[PDB]
Every structure is written in C-alpha cells, then in structure tokens.
Design a protein around this nucleic acid. Structure first.
Ligand code: CL
Ligand code: CL
Ligand code: K
Ligand code: MG
Ligand code: MG
Ligand code: MG
Ligand code: MG
Ligand code: MG
Ligand code: MG
Ligand code: MG
Ligand code: MG
Ligand code: MG
Ligand code: MG
Ligand code: NA
Ligand code: NA
Ligand code: NA
Ligand code: NA
Ligand code: NA
Ligand code: NA
Ligand code: NA
Ligand code: NA
Ligand code: NA
Ligand code: NA
Ligand code: NA
Ligand code: SR
Ligand code: SR
Ligand code: SR
Ligand code: SR
Ligand code: SR
Lengths: 81, 46, 65, 194, 119
RNA sequence: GCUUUACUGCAGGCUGUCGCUGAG
RNA sequence: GCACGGAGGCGAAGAACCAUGGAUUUCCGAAUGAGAAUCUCUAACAAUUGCUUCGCGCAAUGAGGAACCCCGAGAACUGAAACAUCUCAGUAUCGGGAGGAACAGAAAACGCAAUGUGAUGUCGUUAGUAACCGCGAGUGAACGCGAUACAGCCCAAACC
C-alpha cells in the first residue's frame, strides 16, 4: 500500500511560497491525484487545504504545491517538522 | 516533441544515472562512471 | 532494535495499528528533516523505523490482524 | 444374434446404396451449409464410434469436420529450383485429410483431446469426418476404467504429435515387420525417409 | 422419414402407447433399439414401436424390413421421449418391443390389424 | 541480367474423360 | 553485499551467516474488462472450449525452457571435375506440439523354411553385404546373432 506524501519539498522557491503565499510543497506519489493530496495533507497536519497544483518532475516524482486556508499558517506548520 | 508520463520517467532515470561515482566509493575501494552520457554526443532510446 | 518481536506479538491488533501509525509518522518526520538537509539525524533509526514497520506488518498478517 | 449396431455398419459398407444413399443426399445439403467444425450430440455412425472408444457419457464429445478435397494447395517457387523441385500441380501433402480434420477439431476444442475419428462421406469437393474428443478434466472420465488413460499429461495435444490411430497409420506404423524399417519407432529418428 | 412409409393417426398412436404401458405392468417389454432388434431376430416379439424423431436415422433404419421378413408387426410413434415414458423409462427410446403383452393382447392385436389395413 | 523457332522443365489457357451426378 | 569511506547503528532480548518453511512481492509481460511504446479509462477467466445448479457457478487452454523428442513444410551453394535424374539432404531454415525424457510396443510378426524364434527401443555386429543408380558419381537396409532391460494388458461385439 503506497502512501501519498513522501516528504516536504524544501528549496528557496518553496520557502517563498510558504512565507508569501501560505503554500506548502511536497514530494508525493505520482499516482496521487490533487484530491488525494489535499485529503492526505489535511489528515497529517490538521489543516484546511484550499488549492493543490501538481507537476510530474524530471526526477521521476510528482511535486505538489498546497495552499492552506487563511485560517492556517504554513510557516508554523512546516516549522514543527 | 511531446513526452508521455512514462517517457518522462525514463528520461528522468537516464538523467539520474548520469551522475558520478561518489567520492567515498573511491576511498572505500581504494581506487569512472562507464555509463556517462552526453545529451549531444550520445543518443538515448525511444 | 528498541522494538522487539515479543512486544509486537504482545500488542493487541489495535495497539499494532496505532503503533504502526506512530512509527510511520516518526519516519515521515525523519525524511522531512533529511529533505531539509537537517543534520540532527541518526541514520540508524531512519533504518530501524523501516524494519520495525515491516515487523509490525509481518506480525499483523500472521495473527490475522 | 446380430447387434442392432451391425446394421448401421452394414449400411455404411455401401454409402451409395439403399436408404443410406438417400440420407446422405439429404444430409450433405445441410452439412454444406454448416461450418468447418460442428459439434453434434450423437455420432452418425454409432457402431464405428463405440467401436473406436465412444461412450454416452459426460466428457465425451463428437464433432463433424469438413475439409477441401484434393492435393496440396501449394505456391510455385519464387526462387531458383532444379526441374525436380519446380512441381506444383501433382504435389500432395504427406498427411491425409482425416488427419487434417482431426487437428482442426482439436484446435476448436483446446481443452479436449482427440480419441479417434472416422469418415462420414464426401461430395465432389469436400470430405467430412466425425471426431471423438474427450474432456481429460472431467471426473466422469478421470474415473472411467476405459478412458482415464487419456488424462495423463503425456497425452496432451496427442493429435498434433501423430499419436492418433489415423496418425499412426499415416506414419506407416501399421506393419510390424517388412516395410517398417524407416517408420518405427518414429519417422524423425529414421532421418525422415519413411 | 426415409424408413417411414406410412403415417399413423394421433389416435392410433394413443392406443398403442397405452397398450405398451399396460404391457410393462402386466406382460413383458424390451426397451432400446438393440434389445428390440434381437427380439425381432429371436422372434420373441409381438409388437415393436419405432420413434420417428430419431437422429441419426441409421439407428432404426433396419427395423422396418427386418420386421417384415420376420412377420413381426411394427408401428411408428412421433416422439422419442413418449415411447421411453410409455416403456417406463426416465429417458427416451428410439425403438421398443412388446415381448408378449399382458391383458392387452386383445388391443395389441387390433392395433396390428389396424396398421396392416393402414398399409 | 537479358533473348530466342537452344536443351529440359514449370505455371497458365484451351480441349476430352472420371468423380460431384439425379429422373424419363 | 561487491567496496579497505565518513558518520552512525545492530548484536548475550544470541545479530551476522547457512538450511528448510512462511510473509511481502509496484508496472509491463501468455497478459485475460477496454485501450496504450511499461501508462490510462469505466467491474471484468478477454478468447476458444467442457461440465453446467445455464450464473464464468466449477474447470481447461494460451506463454517459457540449453538442447534432446514427436508431427508437419522443405532449399541452394556443393559433388558428378559441365549438367538435367542422382548428389549435397529429408540437411539448413520454417509451422505445430509433449515430457523429464520423448517416440515405439504385445504380431493379420519373422521366413538362419524350421520338430525353429516369440512385444518395443537401444548398443555391438550382420555390412558398405542385399538392394538402388546418366548401372556414372554416389546412395544403402533387414532377418539373425551377442548384449542392455524386460511385462504384459484394456476395449468393440456376442450373452445380460
Ligand atoms: Cl489432441
Ligand atoms: Cl528366428
Ligand atoms: K542441384
Ligand atoms: Mg498540470
Ligand atoms: Mg543535474
Ligand atoms: Mg470391463
Ligand atoms: Mg528413438
Ligand atoms: Mg490489459
Ligand atoms: Mg558439378
Ligand atoms: Mg531423391
Ligand atoms: Mg559423368
Ligand atoms: Mg539417401
Ligand atoms: Mg527381414
Ligand atoms: Na525524493
Ligand atoms: Na542526442
Ligand atoms: Na484440443
Ligand atoms: Na548481370
Ligand atoms: Na519474492
Ligand atoms: Na482460465
Ligand atoms: Na458460465
Ligand atoms: Na566440377
Ligand atoms: Na557450371
Ligand atoms: Na540416378
Ligand atoms: Na545361429
Ligand atoms: Sr533534479
Ligand atoms: Sr550531431
Ligand atoms: Sr497445449
Ligand atoms: Sr434423450
Ligand atoms: Sr521379454
């Protein structure tokens, strides 16, 4: 049984998305849909997911850009891991 | 061209294999990446 | 290591699953620290977590859950 | 006294005379409209079928097959040949039509094994044969003392290897003495000269 | 059809089957084309029945002529399964023979007579 | 490789005959 | 692990390692719900069959394997100092199919002709003999015998 979230994608671009747009980025299983990524993220960090953009990477993986609701704070979420 | 998801996975792998033999392997084996490819000089499959 | 087979067999089906979710989380947080280039690692545990999970999963199948 | 079976037999010694003549003339009209392989609930020549091993039991199947009459349907050489190997018209195949019929039937029923077959006539352009096939996987057969032998693994696809009665005859294995120097134990072991 | 040279009325066929059913309960009867054939050959047969829906026809084609040269009377039935039912079988019967009736000799005799007349 | 009234054969076409094929 | 690094970890709760058995076992692949360059689309023995509770309910087939084996299709260079029959050769190659080995096999045999042998392979021999053949070049057995191993049975029908 493959899991959805593989690990946080942490790079300069990710940090900006986190500080400026309340977005979190993850390396996820390429078989995962935007919806499955949303659910997984909410169930793992107890947050509300507003939008999910995806991209199949030239590393053979899928990257997800998850925007959280204004109710949540990406910076704080990512900081506890 | 237009790459499918699988084609893309294969290209990605080829790119990964194009890295070098890590430094530590040198010390450990007390002393080359034979599959070193170049985008221009070589030709991948498909 | 820290987690032995007896202990796993002594757990109830509910304890194994809870223990499973717990280990999966520690692992996820480890891979996050690693992805963040975090050095406060312990390469041994990241490896142990995988085995522990395989053990629990192996035990779950054996006991019928 | 004579069996009723002997009467079917005696009728078929002269398929062109008596009632049998009229039956065939009638039947072939329908046969000509059927396909290459038609499963039939009952053998047309009961005496012959039972004689060859047929039984009214589960796992026993009978099918009629039609094949074109005549010699080999061969293509003329597209490359160099010495006069000897340029023939086309008078070349005939080495397997008789009955054998070809047995194989077609067996291909139609992949899970069944050919037990035996017999002829049921012909018209001016085709020949019909009826083939008895057995289901080696049905318990009614695995328990039959007279047919269970055909369930053995080495009997799989027996028809395709010439293990059929028509196969053995066509391979020149009928004679146990003179004339069978190149046929027994196999055409192949004898360098294919039989 | 090729062995049937005359048609038997639905009613005559009715009497024959009834007579056959009482023949098994009283007298003796043979079930099957083989047993029927031997009865005719051994001469131990009084009345033989022959279904008309037999396929292949080779199974019973011989009954008619074999019966004639043995003086044994014979009659046709339309359905194969009725003869088998009448003969007391759970299956069908291409042919049947009343080997010495029983409390039906009278009727069986009439039937034979009604047939000869029916040509 | 090509040619032809070179040698020898092979397709193909025409034609007879037998089978399919029966009644007066 | 190969592989002698750094860091770190595991092992007396007896690890490593080895044997046996079990668990897990992505996607494509005979590939089987439909499609596709290993992915996708909306519950699946696809297809062909047997049985059948006539419902994919129960089953079979498919593809692989170094060669060996059985059944089919079947050349030419070459030899003949040319070449056509012949030869190369039922070889190369092709189609189909089984097994651990295949195939053959209990006489409508043999025919050292006999007051004789007694299923079948195979090995040695019989023998380059008999036989074939532009009677050229070439091709080429068998019975028997000495061995190996041995094993003989079941239906159809008659009568029920
Ligand atoms: Cl077969
Ligand atoms: Cl002898
Ligand atoms: K030649
Ligand atoms: Mg996109
Ligand atoms: Mg790079
Ligand atoms: Mg018996
Ligand atoms: Mg052999
Ligand atoms: Mg598919
Ligand atoms: Mg020459
Ligand atoms: Mg020759
Ligand atoms: Mg010469
Ligand atoms: Mg030769
Ligand atoms: Mg001899
Ligand atoms: Na990764
Ligand atoms: Na290139
Ligand atoms: Na078959
Ligand atoms: Na030239
Ligand atoms: Na495995
Ligand atoms: Na199947
Ligand atoms: Na079904
Ligand atoms: Na020469
Ligand atoms: Na020459
Ligand atoms: Na010659
Ligand atoms: Na001697
Ligand atoms: Sr990269
Ligand atoms: Sr170039
Ligand atoms: Sr097969
Ligand atoms: Sr019936
Ligand atoms: Sr012996």
């Amino acid at each position: 049984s493959w899991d959805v979230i593989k690990h946080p994608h942490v790079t300069e671009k990710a940090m900006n998305d986190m500080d400026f747009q309340n977005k979190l980025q993850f390396a996820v299983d390429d078989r995962a849909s935007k919806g499955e990524v949303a659910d997984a993220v909410e169930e793992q960090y107890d947050v509300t997911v507003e939008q999910v953009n995806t991209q199949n990477t030239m590393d053979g993986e899928k990257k997800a850009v998850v925007r959280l609701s204004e109710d949540d704070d990406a910076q704080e979420v990512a900081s506890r891991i | 061209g237009k790459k499918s998801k699988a084609t893309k996975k294969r290209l990605a792998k080829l790119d990964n294999q194009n890295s070098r033999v890590p430094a530590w392997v040198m010390l450990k084996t007390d002393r080359r990446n034979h599959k070193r490819r170049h985008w221009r000089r070589n030709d991948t499959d498909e | 290591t820290v987690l032995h087979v007896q202990e796993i067999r002594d757990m109830t089906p509910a304890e194994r699953e809870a223990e499973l979710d717990d280990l999966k989380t520690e692992l996820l947080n480890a891979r996050a620290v690693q992805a963040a280039g975090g050095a406060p690692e312990n390469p041994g545990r990241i490896k142990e977590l995988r085995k522990a999970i395989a053990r629990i999963k192996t035990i779950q199948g054996e006991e019928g859950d | 006294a004579r069996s009723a079976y002997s009467y079917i037999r005696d009728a078929w010694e002269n398929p062109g005379d008596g009632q049998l003549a009229e039956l065939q003339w009638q039947r072939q009209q329908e046969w000509r409209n059927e396909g290459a392989v038609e499963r039939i609930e009952r053998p047309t020549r009961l005496d012959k079928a039972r004689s060859q091993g047929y039984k009214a039991k589960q796992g026993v199947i009978v099918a009629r097959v039609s094949v074109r009459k005549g010699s080999a349907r061969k293509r003329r050489h597209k490359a160099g040949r010495r006069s000897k190997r340029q023939g086309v018209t008078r070349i005939t195949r080495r397997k008789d039509i009955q054998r070809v019929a047995e194989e077609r039937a067996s291909r139609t029923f992949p899970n069944l094994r050919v037990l035996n077959s017999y002829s049921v006539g012909q018209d001016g352009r085709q020949k019909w044969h009826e083939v008895i096939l057995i289901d080696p996987n049905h318990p009614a057969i695995q328990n039959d003392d007279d047919l269970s032998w055909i369930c053995a693994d080495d009997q799989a696809d027996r028809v395709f290897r010439g293990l059929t009665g028509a196969g053995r005859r066509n391979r020149g294995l009928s004679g146990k003495g003179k004339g069978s120097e190149k046929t027994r134990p196999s055409l192949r072991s004898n360098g294919g000269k039989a | 059809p090729v062995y049937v040279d005359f048609d038997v009325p639905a009613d005559l066929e009715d009497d024959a089957l009834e007579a056959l059913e009482v023949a098994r309960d009283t007298g003796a009867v043979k079930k099957g084309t083989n047993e029927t054939t031997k009865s005719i050959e051994r001469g131990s047969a009084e009345l033989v029945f022959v279904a008309e829906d037999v396929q292949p026809e080779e199974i019973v084609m011989h009954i008619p002529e074999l019966a004639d040269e043995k003086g044994v009377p014979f009659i046709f039935v339309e359905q194969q399964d009725d003869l088998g039912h009448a003969a007391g079988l759970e299956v069908g019967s291409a042919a049947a023979a009343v080997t010495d009736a029983g409390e039906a000799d009278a009727d069986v005799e009439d039937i034979a007579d009604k047939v000869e007349e029916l040509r």
